[PDB]
C-alpha cells in the first residue's frame, strides 16, 4: 500500500495527491487475485503519462482508465467518496 | 441545474425500509431537452431542428 | 384391530391436551418485535 | 465461488431477497461440521 500526503487543491473540491494515481476496485471483486494483480503493474506505467498530461495542461480534471476487469485507475489520487465498510454505508460502483 | 432529472410522482414506502440497508442512490444522467428548459413555441422547434 | 383401544386413548389425550392449550395459550403468540416505524420482523442470523 | 482461492474478499447478502437491501459479509471457505474426510469423521456422520 501507499500512504499519500493529500494536499488540498482547488479545481477539486477535495484533497488530492499528484505523486501517483488512485485505484478503485469493486467491493465484491477480491483485490489480490491473479487477474487483478496482473492488471496493477501494467497499469502502473500510466502514472507517467498522467503526470505529463497534468503538467502540459494544469487546468485538466480527472484522468481515468476503466479496466475490463473492474479496476479504475484515476489521476490525481484521492480517497473514494464512499469507502467500503469503515462506516455503516457501502458503495456500489463498477466502472463497467 | 445539478439536480437529477425526476420521473413521475415519487412514491416511497417507509414501512419496508430497514435503517441499515444502504440502498443505491442513482446513476442516471442529467438529460434535459432544449424545449424543456424554456417555454416552447413553434419557432423554437424549427430553430432547434 | 387390537390397537383400537390405544387409538381411542390417543385421540382422547390429544383432545384433552388441545383443549388445555386452547385455554392456556390462546392469542398469546401474536406479538413480536419489528423495526421501529416499519413492518419488518427483527431477527438475527440463525434465529427463526 | 467454487474454489478456495476464489472464496476471498467480501460479498453482498440481501435481506428477505430484496435487491435494494444489502449488507457486506466476508466470504470464507467453510468445511461442513459432519463430513467424510476420514473414517472417524465418516463414522461420526453415519452415527448422526
Ligand atoms: C511489475 O513488477 C515487476 C517486478 O517487480 C517489474 O519488473 C521489474 O522492472 C524493473 C525496471 O523495469 C527491473 O529493474 C531492473 O532490473 C535489472 C536487472 O534485471 C537491472 O539491471 C536494472 O538496473 C533495473 O534495476 C526489475 O528487475 C524487474 N523485476 C523483474 C522480476 O523482472 C515490472 O516492470 C512491473 N510492471 C511494470 C509495468 O513496470
Q: Which residue, among D1, D15, D14, has the nearest Cα to D28 in the 3D structure?
A: D1
Question: What separation in angstroms does the CA of A66 have from each of A6, A23, A26, C24, D4?
Answer: 23, 10, 12, 66, 28
Q: Is the dihedral of CA D18, D22, D25, D27 positive or negative?
A: positive
Residue found under cell 502540459? A56
Q: Do chains A and D touch (3 or more CB pairs under 8 A)?
A: yes
Q: Which residue, among D29, D24, D32, D31, has the nearest Cα to D6 in the 3D structure?
A: D29
How many angstroms separate the CA atoms of A16 and A10, rounded? 9
**B-D contacts at Cβ under 8 angstroms:** 14
Helices (H), ranges, C1-48: 4-25
Per-residue DSSP letter, D23:
E
Question: What separation in angstroms does the CA of D32 have from each of A57, A87, D29, D42, D45?
Answer: 59, 32, 10, 12, 11
Ligand 1: lining residues by beta carbon, under 6 Å = A 41-42, 44-45
Q: Which residue, among A90, A75, A84, A83, has the nearest Cα to A12 in the 3D structure?
A: A75
Residue found under cell 456500489? A92
Q: Which residue, among C38, D17, A30, A87, has the nearest Cα to B22 in the 3D structure?
A: A87
For A16, the enclosing helix (H) or strand (E) is strand A14-16
Q: Print burial letters for A58-68: b (CB count within 10 Å at least 16), e (below 16).
A: eeeeebebebe
Q: Which residue, among C16, A57, D34, A88, has the nearest Cα to B23 in the 3D structure?
A: A88
Cell of A53: 498530461
Interface of A with D (CB under 8 A): 27-33, 84-85, 90
Resolution in A: 2.8
How many angstroms separate the CA atoms of A94 and D27, rounded? 19
Amino acid at each position: 500500500r501507499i500512504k499519500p500526503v493529500f494536499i488540498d487543491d482547488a479545481n477539486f473540491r477535495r484533497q488530492v495527491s499528484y505523486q501517483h494515481a488512485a485505484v478503485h476496485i469493486p467491493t465484491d471483486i477480491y483485490e489480490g487475485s491473479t487477474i487483478v494483480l496482473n492488471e496493477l503493474n501494467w497499469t502502473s506505467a500510466l502514472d507517467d503519462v498522467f503526470k505529463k498530461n497534468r503538467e502540459e495542461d494544469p487546468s485538466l480534471l480527472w484522468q481515468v482508465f476503466g479496466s475490463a476487469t473492474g479496476l479504475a485507475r484515476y489521476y490525481p489520487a484521492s480517497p473514494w467518496v464512499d469507502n467500503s465498510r469503515t462506516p455503516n454505508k457501502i458503495d456500489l460502483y463498477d466502472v463497467r | 441545474q445539478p439536480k437529477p432529472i425526476g420521473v413521475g410522482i415519487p412514491t416511497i414506502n417507509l414501512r419496508k425500509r430497514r435503517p441499515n440497508v444502504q440502498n443505491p442512490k442513482s446513476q442516471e444522467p442529467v438529460t434535459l431537452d432544449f424545449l424543456d428548459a424554456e417555454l416552447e413555441n413553434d419557432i423554437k422547434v424549427e430553430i432547434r431542428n | 384391530l387390537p390397537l383400537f383401544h390405544i387409538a381411542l386413548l390417543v385421540l382422547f389425550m390429544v383432545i384433552i391436551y388441545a383443549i388445555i392449550g386452547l385455554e392456556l395459550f390462546k392469542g398469546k403468540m401474536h406479538k413480536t418485535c419489528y423495526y421501529i416505524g416499519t413492518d419488518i420482523v427483527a431477527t438475527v442470523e440463525n434465529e427463526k | 465461488k467454487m474454489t478456495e482461492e476464489e472464496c476471498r474478499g467480501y460479498y453482498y447478502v440481501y435481506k428477505d431477497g430484496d435487491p435494494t437491501q444489502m449488507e457486506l459479509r466476508p466470504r470464507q471457505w467453510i468445511h461442513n461440521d459432519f463430513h467424510f474426510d476420514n473414517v472417524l469423521s465418516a463414522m461420526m456422520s453415519l452415527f448422526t
